[PDB]
Each structure stands twice: as C-alpha cells, then as structure tokens.
Paper text:
The covalent modification of Lys residues with the 76 amino acid protein ubiquitin (Ub) constitutes one of the most important cellular signals, most commonly targeting the substrate protein for proteasomal degradation. Most recently, based on mass spectrometry and following from earlier findings that PINK1 phosphorylates the Parkin Ub-like (Ubl) domain (Kondapalli et al, 2012), three groups showed that Ub itself is a substrate for PINK1, which phosphorylates Ub Ser65 exclusively, in vitro and in cells (Kane et al, 2014; Kazlauskaite et al, 2014; Koyano et al, 2014). We here show that PINK1 is a Ub and polyUb kinase and reveal wide-ranging consequences of Ub Ser65 phosphorylation. PINK1-mediated phosphorylation of Ub at Ser65 has dramatic consequences for Ub structure, and key processes in the Ub system, namely Ub attachment and removal.
Author numbering: 1 to 74
Write the structure that this text describes.
Amino acid sequence: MQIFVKTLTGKTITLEVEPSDTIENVKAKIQDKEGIPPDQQRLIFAGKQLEDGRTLSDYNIQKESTLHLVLRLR
C-alpha cells in the first residue's frame, strides 16, 4: 500500500509498504530518501510513538494514511 510520511519541516514523502512491514523497515526506507539514521528517527501515529519491532498492521495504519516523522538527535 501507499503511505505518507510527514516531516514537520513542512514536506512529505510517499512510501511503498505492506501491512506486515515493521516500523524498523519503514525507518530504513525513510533513510533511503532522507538520509536520517534510524536511531535518530521517531515515528508518530494517532498520538502514539511507534515501536521499532512492531508492524504497521499492529497500529491499524491503512492505505493513504500518514505517519509523522520527528528527529531525536542528541
């Protein structure tokens, strides 16, 4: 399915994913487009911080829905 990842910098990217994809897996695809290391990414959906080892289906993330990407640096 297609999902969207919003950076609060203003911009958005599309991602191509499966419901069984892990957040880890999503982070890797974000790094491929944005260059941000996975341990400096945090993803937010429906007011929850998403865990690395869990899947999109675990969080009821559906086609054309949107995740929010936040930086955790120092």
